[PDB]
Every structure is written in C-alpha cells, then in structure tokens.
Amino acid sequence: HMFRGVGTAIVTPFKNGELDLESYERLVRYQLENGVNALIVLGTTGESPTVNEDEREKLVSRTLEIVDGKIPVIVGAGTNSTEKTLKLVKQAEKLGANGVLVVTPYYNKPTQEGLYQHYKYISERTDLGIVVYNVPGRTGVNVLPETAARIAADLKNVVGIKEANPDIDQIDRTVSLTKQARSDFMVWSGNDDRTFYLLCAGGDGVISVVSNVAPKQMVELCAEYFSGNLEKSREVHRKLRPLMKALFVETNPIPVKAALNLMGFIENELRLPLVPASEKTVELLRNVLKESGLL
Amino acid sequence: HMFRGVGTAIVTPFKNGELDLESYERLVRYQLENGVNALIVLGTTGESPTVNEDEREKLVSRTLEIVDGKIPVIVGAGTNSTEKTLKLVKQAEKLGANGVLVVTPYYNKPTQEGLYQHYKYISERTDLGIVVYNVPGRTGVNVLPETAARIAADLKNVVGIKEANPDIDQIDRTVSLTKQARSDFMVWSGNDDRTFYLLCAGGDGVISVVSNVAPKQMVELCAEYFSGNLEKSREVHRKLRPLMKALFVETNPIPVKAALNLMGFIENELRLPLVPASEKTVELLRNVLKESGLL
Amino acid sequence: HMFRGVGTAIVTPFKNGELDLESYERLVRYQLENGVNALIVLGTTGESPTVNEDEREKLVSRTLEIVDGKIPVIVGAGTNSTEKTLKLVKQAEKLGANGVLVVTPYYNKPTQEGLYQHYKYISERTDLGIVVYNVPGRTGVNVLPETAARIAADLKNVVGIKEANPDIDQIDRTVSLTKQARSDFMVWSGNDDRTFYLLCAGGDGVISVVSNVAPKQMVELCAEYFSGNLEKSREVHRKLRPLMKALFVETNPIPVKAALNLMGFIENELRLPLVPASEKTVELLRNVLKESGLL
Amino acid sequence: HMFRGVGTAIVTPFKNGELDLESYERLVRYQLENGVNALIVLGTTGESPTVNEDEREKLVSRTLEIVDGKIPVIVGAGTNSTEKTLKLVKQAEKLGANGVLVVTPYYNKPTQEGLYQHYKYISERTDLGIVVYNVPGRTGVNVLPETAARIAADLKNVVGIKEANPDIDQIDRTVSLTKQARSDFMVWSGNDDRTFYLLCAGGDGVISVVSNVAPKQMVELCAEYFSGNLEKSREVHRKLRPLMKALFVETNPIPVKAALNLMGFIENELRLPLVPASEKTVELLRNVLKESGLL
Ligand SMILES: [Ca+2]
Ligand SMILES: [Ca+2]
C-alpha cells in the first residue's frame, strides 16, 4: 500500500548546475521531522527530464541512506517508451527503491488500450510496487477511470494511482471504480488543492508539492480527515489555499524552488528549459510564506 | 529556407520488431516520385519516442543516401531537456542532415523565456537550420506568436516554425508576427486540415502526415495556391477532408500505419505504448482510401 | 435562509401543449410526502422560457395552494434585462412567493460589475429573498466567487446562491468567500452530481433536478451528511450517480420529463424549441429507473 | 440572398434613458456613405434584450424610412421560445423589414432536432427571409454544420447563416455543407476577426460590429477579396486587427459604444445589466482609433 497521508514530491536541488546533495539532505530531514509518510524522488517536481542517469543513481541512493527505512522512497521512472520505462524501473529496483511512480507516456498520446499494455508490460517484469501517475495537462492523455480500474483489477503489482486530473468527476470515479475493482488499491491526489476533496471521495492522501515547504500543515490536513474531523481538515485546506495557488503561478517546480530558496534550504537554480521564478512570483511567495508562518 | 510546399513527416516502418528499411525506401521513393519538397524523419509520425539510438543513426543515414540531395532531410531532434536536445541536434549535424525539427519541450511546461533560452542555447551551438515545432495538444505548452517572433528576430539559425496549434488566431498571428520580425522566416502548418488556411494567412506549406499516403494531392493543394488558384486549392482541401480526418481518429501514427499497410507499403507494426488501429478504424480507412483512389 | 437540504426544481407538466395542473399537483404531493425542503418553480427545469405570464401566475398560485405553507416556494424570475427581471420579481412577490431565483443575465454576457448592479437594482426594490443562480454553461457568464461575496456582503435581501458551475475550485471558493462575507449566506448546489462535494465544502444542500423522480434519496444524501455520516452520504451519492448522469444525456428537462412519464406522473410533452427524449435516452432511463427501485 | 459584403450590426443609441434617434440617424448615414451592404438592427450589438416593444417598433420603422430601400434592413427577432420568436418575426414582417436575424434559442440548449423544428415552425409561418445566427459562446448551443445544411436543404425561407462560432473547422464545414445542400445559401461571418478566413472558405461576407466605426475598411476587406485581390484583403484584415480586438476587450457592445462616443456619434449610455466601458478600455480605444485614423 506504500503509504497513507502525505508523500512529498521532493525537489532536486542544484548548485552551479550540479546536484546539491548537502541542501537535499537538509530538505529530507525537514520532511522526516515533520511527519511526512513517503518521499517521491525524481517526479516532475524533482526535474526528472533534466537529471541524467548517473545523477538519478546518486540521488536515489542518497535518499534511501538518509531515510533509514523509516518511510518508503518511491522513484519516478516513467517515460513515453515502454522499453525505456522498464529499464528505469529495473534501475530503481536494483537501487533498492520501495516503489516506482510511472507517468502515463507523455507526447505520443497512447490509446487507453496502449496505456493498459504499457503498465502490463512493466508490471509483468518487476517485483516493485508501481504507482500510475495521471496528469493530462502535462502529458496530453487522460487515463479514464475505467482504464485505471482495469489496471487495478488485473495488475497485482500496480498498487495505486496519483490522480492529477483536477476534474472532481474524474477524482470521484477514479476512487470509486478502482476500489471497487480492488479494495486495497490506493488513490492519492496529484494536486495539493484537490487533496481535501479527494479525501472526501474516499482516497488515501496526496503526493504533494506544497509539503516541500509546509510538510506539517499538509500532514495535518490528512491527519485531521483520517481522525474524523472533516471541518478541521477543511480549515487546514482553506488556510493553505494561498500557498497552494502561489506555488503554481509559474510551472512547478519554478515557484517551489524560489520558495525553498527564500526559506534558506536551496539555491534558486533550475535546469533549462526551466528558469528561475520572476520577481513578481518571488514577491508573492515571500508574502504568502510570511502570512503562513513559514518565513 | 528548407522548402515551400509539402514536407512529409514520414513513418518509421517496423517488421518483426526491427526497422524495415526495404519498406521505408519504397515509401521514400513514393514521396519523391510525387513531388514532395522535404522529408521530416523521426518526428512523432516517425515514432521518435520508441526508436533507439542505433536505429536513429541508421534511419537518418539511409534516408540521406536514398534522397541523394534531391530535397532536404530534416531530422526530429527535440526532447524536453536542453542538454539532451543539443546532443541529438549535433548527431544529426554530424550525419549531414539538412536541418532539425525541434519540438518545444513537452511535459515540463517551460515558461516563454525558457522556450527562448532553450532555442538560443541550441542555436548558438550548431550550424544546422532549426525548425521550432509547436503542438500544444501533445506537449502541454504553446509557443506564443510573440515568442516565435522574438526567436525569429534573434536566432539566425532558427529558420522557421511548424505551427500545429489549430487555432486560426494563433496561425494568423504566428505568420504575421514572425514574418514582420524576419521576412524570410518560414511558417509551415503542422496540421493537414489547416494547410489551406495557413497558406491563406501567408504561410509556406505543410509538414504533413496525409502526404504519407496522398503525396501528390497535398502537393497539388499547395501548388494550386502558389500558382494563384485559390479555389482550386480549396477544392483539393475539401476533397482530402475525409482522409485528413480519418488519419486522426486514433492518435497519429496509428491510422496512417494501418493505411500504409492496407496500401501494401509497410507491416502494420508499432511500438508500445502505441498499438495497431481498431477494426473500426481500419474499416473507415479502407473506405476512405478507396473513395480517394488510393486503394 | 429559505431552506437547507433539497429544493426540487420542479418540472412544468403539459398536456396537449397546455399546463397540466392535475399532473403537477400529483408531482408536488410526491415531493412533499418524501421530505423535500423547498420547491423551485419556473427554473430551467420547469421550462421558464416557454411559459407565458398568465401561465406563470396560475402555476405559482397553485403551488402555494397545495403546499399550505409547509415549505417555501421559490419562483424563477431572472431574465437578461434588469428592468424586466424586476417586473417578474414584483409579480412573484405579489403572488405570495417565499423567494425568487434569479439567474445571471444570459446571452448578453454582462461584466462582473454589471452583475453586481443588476442584483443591487433588484434587491433595493423588493422585500423578497433573492437567490443568485450561476450556470455559465447556459448563460455565457460566470459569477466570480469574489463577485458573489460582494453581493453577499452588500445586498441584505440576496440570501444565497445556486452554484451550477461544476468546477470544484469555483464551488470551494463560492462557499468560502460568501460565508466569510456573511456567515448566514446560503450556498446550494445547482448540480445534483456536485451536491456531495458542495456539502463537504460547507454548503447548504441542493436545488435538484433528480429529486423530481427520487426525492427521498436526494433528501437522504443531505440528511446523512448533516447528521455527520459522511461515508453514508457518499454511498447515497454513488448509488444515485447513474440516475444523475442519465438525466442529463440530453438537455434538462428533456430526460427528466421522459422519466416522469415512464413513472406515470406526466405526459412526455415539452414546448419548442425543446422536444421529447430520443428512444435511446428513454431506454437508458427505463433501465436506470428499474435498477434504482423507482420503476 | 439579402447581400454580399458588410452588414452592420448597428448599435441602438440611448440618451437620458430613451432612444436617441437623432444620433442613430447620423450613424445610419455614416454606414450608407461608406458602402455598407445591409443593416442588422436589434442584434445583440443593438442591445436587443433591453429595448422594449414600443422602442423596437420605432427603431425599425425609422431605419426603414432613413434607408429608403437602398440596402436591406434585417431585424433581430430571435428568442428562446419558438412561440415568442414567431411573434417578433411577424412584427418585423408587418413593418416591412427585408429579413430577420434569428439567433439559436439561448439558455435552454435545444437539441439539434429542436433547432431544426424551431426554424421550421417559423419558416412555415412567415414570408420573410430568415437568417440563422449561431453564437455558442453567448447561447450555450452550437448549430452543427450538418444541421445548418439540413435547414438549408429543407426550409426555403431560411436564406443563410451568421456563423459566429470562431472555430475554423466549423467555419469551413458550415460554408461547405450548406452550399452543397443549396448553392445560393448565404454564409456570413459573425466575428470580424474571422471575416478574411470565412471569405477564403467560400463565404459571403460579414455581419459586423467593427463596421459601426470603420465601415469603409470592412467594406474594403470584402471588396478586395471579391475582386480577386487576396493579399490586399489580408492586409486590410491585418491593419484592422487592433481595432477588432479592442472592440471585444469587454463584452460587445460596451467598447463599441465607448468608441462611437469618443468619435462624437452617440452618448456612452447602455442599459443594465450592461454598464459603460472601464477607463482602461477607453484608453485603449482612444489609442487604437487614433492609430486607425478614426479620431
Ligand atoms: Ca543511513
Ligand atoms: Ca391549500
């Protein structure tokens, strides 16, 4: 099942364009100390498109070393080639990852059957737990709820889905249909500002961007819900809304890296084609961070 | 300037899991015999995500030797990492490609400045002509006409854009603003069913999927326009409509490969996550190809 | 406050193209007997565009007569002219309606300020409670949450909003911002399939189409939520989903009238430009009604 | 066939709450002096929702006497009730209007068959020429090209369509399919900034907002096209772009009325729920009108 609650989609810090593991380790310790229940390394938020294979090995191994088996480490490993995706999955397995996060193939817009065949191929060839990641605004393809349910029903190794389609109809149906196919199938929000409603739909938490900066608050949002305090969960959601929105005024992780820098955790460096946040975004983040008690 | 008229985004035929260069060459001669003005190899129509490094080199080298300088060979070489893109570009340059088609970074949704910096970084480090490729439905990002025009103004090496945003306002403005910044900047449609309108806007032709099966007719659509025969060009556009629509009932190149197979050119073989066309798709194609005289 | 829970947006039955008050009265008694908390007469679901002024008077008066003051009767009275809207509002007032439902002006796409001025003008000129009705898919204009909050803050007579924008971000913000402006401001869902999530957002119920056929079940959905049984509320929502969806496979109230006819309540008659449900829709409704225990 | 070229959707000037027929006549002469081929009175540009019955009659009667048969006067007469629409149509017919513009029923989202039945019901009961008006952004419904073509095929009295769906595929298909069903069926753009492309598609001109302020230039755009000068027509299109865009920065006719007021034609007076243009809008207009030579 991997986890319930908050899994942080952690940034990949750079300094002088190189991996900055000393800043990374400070960030991992902040997550651990604030009750986060998983780390997702090398997702979109960690600039997976621009981190090379040798760097991935170093980052994955170092994350496993710091965490000491306390929470699972889930490694982004999806590409738009089924063959190449398996290769990345087998690399994460060999490094000792606890699962992989595998985005639907981006850019080549596979059919629903193609998506099924992609995950099947991978599932039949690894012992690792696999999390489907649906994010149509980035990939150009949406996993239909029925397709996710078919994957749940058939592929024992696929243990859950990160649902980043923001449509509440999609969220409602993904949760309902997958859990009907397999009661233990996990459904985590892929959007911080949908976590509350995804919990209400009956899902399992969030694979979060906001938790990079506000881990305790995102943890509290889920924890209050799980404890039966719907209205207190909703209040956390409402208090976090400005931060949730600010972190996406430019493409993630541009804002979250500027935020982590303001907070003193990392240098504000990204790799091309990503570039640092505009002054307007930084100014907004500074204000919102201050208002939220994070600065 | 590369070319005006039709540039065929050619498929990559496979047979029993490997490149099928014999069928590829038949298809290349079919293009050349029918007046096509350029080949774009290893675009999305050419299943670029699933063609390995060895295969890319062989496919480009073979194309260059078949074509024998009669028309330019432009090689798809864009990824969502600026670093990796440059490598693919330099590889094409080393083989003797006449140009590269470089899609906007997909999945990571770079800002407009990031897009500019991406093309600037590559432009400064190759002597090849570069064609920007905008296809927001696949990539998750839209190159603004104003960004295209800045690119045209500043980057001598970027010679044009394949405009696959289907919005006629975008088509109108890309053509208008790029040519204002640089009169010889080329603008080719990236949608067959926008070619006619893009010509009417002041553009330079099309980088086509349909011309895989109907090269003479796409050539004619452009030729008639260019000769001043607007209504004749419109009539070819209208006659081709069913074929243009049929080739996108499932994600390209699933239908076009089925079509080429029906016509006896290639084996109907794709690589995961793509899968062969449905029976319903094949039925439509069989009927449309007959009506068009192609079967 | 009008009501919490379920307010039925009741159909206007016709026979031989005339108002059919005998069938209407049977339908009102069904609502009353099943615990509905309000009736909304002459909304979209009651074909307000095609019911003439003399008919409106008869229908409103007859509804008040049958209900005997047991629940409020809220009359649709919004048009796209501010002057004409007031006239309809004053007519409903004079007939003894308990409130009015006033859609944002459709077709002429007023500015946000225009919307404020429209509701202000009306509010300053009636003693009745006014419910704003936001339904951008029909009107071409969306009331921004901030605009609804400004109306809440300023116009004491505007007592709530029927929120039919299906976007969960809109629903979340409409509830949050209006209740922050005025704690007693009511927010009802305008979409049956958003009621659950609108309750979770902290809203007040639903102005329902589905309750025409399944009043007890929609009442149970809200009642369970209000009683603190989130999971039981969600289960009602899930069981009703097929019916919720079926009632909108063609424009409402085309499906709901076909459903009421299958159930024996009304003739399946609409006024032009509306026409009866297709056989496909009827077949679906028959199945879904049967599965739901309504047939 | 009514006309080819430009038909001005003329504003309805108000002064101190009443019709301003003196300014209206100045504006009518401005149109006639500058070669406009038709007037459309009481369209949405003419604030049809807020003009009362007495005022409609006076405005139509005055227009007919000013124009004195030089060009056709087509009267906006469509509502979302088939019954009421027919009344407005017959009223226009009684006054001596040359035609009626009949928008698809807004707000109630009729099915395609309902749309057909709506126009059939009216067509069978008037001798006037009827122009279908499709503007999905305002009405919530899109007339499918196939429905337009059935209408063209069957209803002798329906003489054309004002196509304000901005999607070039819709424009292409409406023109293609209607003219195939009936060669003399007229197709006019309902968006100024689509006129050029609609002409290129095979259409017959435009029912224009811009021509309120720039009648000669819209006439020229069409005239050049019709004379075979495609690039000259495109150049006028490009030169007019800023004005075309500026007139829709707020909902039409808010900007055009501000523009006409700047030019000294009318008082900048609208009826609720419309309100005068913002300072920012007026600033843009002042600048764009100057650059265009109109101020
Ligand atoms: Ca350790
Ligand atoms: Ca009574």
Q: Exposed/middle/buried for B127, CB within 10 Å: 0-12, 13-18, 19+?
A: exposed
For residue A9, what are the β-bridge partners?
A: A40
Eight-state DSSP code of residue A44? G
Distance from CA of C168 to the nearest CA of A (A): 6
CA distance D150 to D146: 6
In chain A, which residues have their Cβ closer than 8 Å to the Cβ of C176? 238
* Distance from the alpha carbon of residue C261 to the mean position of ligand 2, in angstroms: 26
Residues 6 or more apart from C68 whose CB is under 8 A from it?
none
Minimum-distance CB partner of D238 among B176, B197, B238: B176
Contact, D72 vs D38, CB < 8 A? yes
CA distance B56 to B68: 18
Contact, A110 vs A104, CB < 8 A? yes
CA distance C285 to B26: 55
CATH class of D1-295: alpha beta
Residue ranges of domains in chain D: 1-295
192-211 in chain B: CB under 8 A from chain D = 193-194, 196-197, 200-202
CA distance C129 to C149: 16
Nearest to B272 by CA among A81, A261, A229: A81
Contact, A44 vs B108, CB < 8 A? yes
CA distances in angstroms from C147 to C108, D248, D249, listed in the order given = 18, 21, 19
CA distance C260 to B183: 66
User: Is B162 a residue of the active site?
Assistant: yes
CB count in 10 Å sphere of residue A4? 16
Nearest to B219 by CA among B259, B258, B192: B192
Dihedrals phi, psi of D40, to nearest 5 degrees: -105, 115
Sign of the dihedral through C-alpha A161, A165, A166, A170: negative
Is the previous residue joined to D242 through a cis bond, with omega within 30 degrees of 0? no
CA distance B264 to B258: 10
Sign of the dihedral through C-alpha B245, B246, B248, B250: positive
> How many A/B residue pairs have CB atoms within 8 Å?
123
What's the token pair of residue A149?
Answer: 């349910």
CB count in 10 Å sphere of residue A231? 9
CA distance C21 to C24: 5
CA distance B28 to B8: 9
CB count in 10 Å sphere of residue B228? 10
Eight-state DSSP code of residue D5? E
Closest chain A residue to the Cα of B277, Cα to Cα = A111
Contact, A246 vs A284, CB < 8 A? yes
Contact, D281 vs D250, CB < 8 A? yes
Nearest to D272 by CA among C284, A46, C125: C125
CA distances in angstroms from A131 to A99, A163, C77, listed in the order given = 8, 10, 51
The full length of chain C comes to 295
Distance from CA of C37 to the nearest CA of A (A): 24
* Distance from the alpha carbon of residue A293 to the mean position of ligand 2, in angstroms: 60
Q: What is the 3-state secondary structure (H, E, C) of chain C?
A: CCCCEEEEECCCCEECCEECHHHHHHHHHHHHHCCCCEEEECCHHHCHHHCCHHHHHHHHHHHHHHHCCCCCEEEECCCCCHHHHHHHHHHHHHHCCCEEEEECCCCCCCCHHHHHHHHHHHHCCCCCCEEEEECHHHHCCCCCHHHHHHHHHHCCCEEEEEECCCCHHHHHHHHHHHHHHCCCCEEEECCHHHHHHHHHHCCCEEEECHHHCCHHHHHHHHHHHHCCCHHHHHHHHHHHHHHHHHCCCCCCCHHHHHHHHHCCCCCCCCCCCCCCCCHHHHHHHHHHHHHCCCC
Using the Cβ of B109 and the Cβ atoms of chain A, whether some distance falls under 8 Å is answered with yes
The upper half-sphere exposure of residue D130, i.e. CA atoms within 13 Å in the direction of its Cβ, equals: 29
Radius of gyration of chain C (CA): 18
For residue D73, what are the β-bridge partners?
A: D39
CA distances in angstroms from C48 to B173, B246, C45, C60, C278, listed in the order given = 43, 42, 8, 12, 22
Give resolution, Å, one decimal.
1.8
Nearest to A100 by CA among A116, A79, A117, A80: A79
CB count in 10 Å sphere of residue A266? 24
CA distance C199 to C168: 12
D8-30: b or e for each residue (b if 16 or more CB lie within 10 Å)? bbbbbbbeeeebbbebbeebbeb
Chains C and B touch (3+ CB pairs under 8 A): no
DSSP chain B: ---SEEEEE----EETTEE-HHHHHHHHHHHHHTT--EEEESSTTTTGGG--HHHHHHHHHHHHHHHTTSS-EEEE---S-HHHHHHHHHHHHHHT-SEEEEE---SS---HHHHHHHHHHHHTT--SEEEEEE-HHHHS----HHHHHHHHHH-TTEEEEEE----HHHHHHHHHHHHHH-TT-EEEESSGGGHHHHHHHT--EEEESGGGT-HHHHHHHHHHHHTT-HHHHHHHHHHTHHHHHHTTSSSTTHHHHHHHHHTTSS-----TT--PPPHHHHHHHHHHHHHTT--
Q: What is the 3-state secondary structure (H, E, C) of B215-263?
A: HHHHHHHHHHHHCCCHHHHHHHHHHCHHHHHHCCCCCCCHHHHHHHHHC
Q: Where are the alpha helices (DSSP H) in chain D?
A: 21-33, 53-67, 82-95, 112-123, 136-139, 145-154, 168-181, 195-201, 215-226, 230-239, 241-246, 254-262, 279-291
Nearest to D40 by CA among D283, D267, D277, D253: D253
Distance from CA of B77 to the nearest CA of A (A): 14
Nearest to C129 by CA among C180, C165, C77: C77
For residue B162, what are the β-bridge partners?
A: B133, B188
CB count in 10 Å sphere of residue B195? 28
Contact, C15 vs C267, CB < 8 A? yes
The full length of chain B comes to 295
Contact, C11 vs C215, CB < 8 A? no
Query: DSSP 3-state assignment of D38?
Result: strand
Radius of gyration of chain D (CA): 18
DSSP D165-213: ---HHHHHHHHHHHHHH-TT-EEEESSGGGHHHHHHHT--EEEESGGGT
CB count in 10 Å sphere of residue D156? 12
Nearest to C210 by CA among C172, C250, C260, C171: C260
Contact, B9 vs B40, CB < 8 A? yes
Query: DSSP 3-state assignment of D62?
Result: helix
CA distance C118 to B202: 46
For residue D186, what are the β-bridge partners?
A: D160
Identity of the residue numbered A51: V
Contact, A4 vs A41, CB < 8 A? no
CA distance C146 to C173: 8
Helix (H) or strand (E) holding D132: strand D129-134
CA distance C65 to C74: 14
B162-190: b or e for each residue (b if 16 or more CB lie within 10 Å)? bbbbbbbbbbbbbbbbbbebbeebbbbbb
Q: How far is CA C110 from the centre of its chain?
A: 22
Query: DSSP 3-state assignment of D15?
Result: strand
For residue D129, what are the β-bridge partners?
A: D99
For chain D, the first-to-last Cα distance in angstroms comes to: 35
Pairing of strands A18-19, A14-15: antiparallel
Contact, C43 vs C101, CB < 8 A? yes
Nearest to D13 by CA among D78, D59, D70: D59
Chains near D (3 or more Cβ pairs under 8 Å): B, C
Q: Exposed/middle/buried for D294, CB within 10 Å: 0-12, 13-18, 19+?
A: middle
Contact, C277 vs C250, CB < 8 A? yes
Dihedrals phi, psi of A166, to nearest 5 degrees: -75, -5
Query: DSSP 3-state assignment of D243?
Result: helix
Tokens 């490729």, residue located: B133
Distance from CA of B54 to the nearest CA of D (A): 41
Q: How far is CA C46 from the centre of its chain?
A: 9
Residues 6 or more apart from D181 whose CB is under 8 A from it?
D149, D150, D152, D153
Nearest to B246 by CA among B213, B199, B202: B213
Contact, A259 vs A192, CB < 8 A? no
CB count in 10 Å sphere of residue D238? 18
Nearest to A12 by CA among A184, A276, A275, A267: A267
Instruction: List the single best residue of D146, D163, D200 to mutate versus B (max B Cβ within 10 A).
Output: D200
User: Is A133 a residue of the active site?
Assistant: yes
Tokens 């670093």, residue located: B83
Identity of the residue numbered C218: M
The upper half-sphere exposure of residue B60, i.e. CA atoms within 13 Å in the direction of its Cβ, equals: 28
Query: DSSP 3-state assignment of A74?
Result: strand
Eight-state DSSP code of residue A184? T
CA distance D86 to C7: 34
CA distance A77 to A83: 12
67-86 in chain B: CB under 8 A from chain A = 79-83
Radius of gyration of chain B (CA): 18
For residue B188, what are the β-bridge partners?
A: B162
* Distance from the alpha carbon of residue C20 to the mean position of ligand 2, in angstroms: 18
Is the previous residue joined to C273 through a cis bond, with omega within 30 degrees of 0? yes
Nearest to B84 by CA among B133, B122, B116, B46: B122
Dihedrals phi, psi of A133, to nearest 5 degrees: -125, 115
**Are C197 and A194 a contacting pair at CB < 8 A?**
no
Query: DSSP 3-state assignment of A166?
Result: coil
19-58 in chain B: CB under 8 A from chain A = 44, 47, 49-50
CB count in 10 Å sphere of residue D91? 17
CA distances in angstroms from C130 to C99, C162, D87, D235, listed in the order given = 6, 11, 31, 52
Eight-state DSSP code of residue D114? H
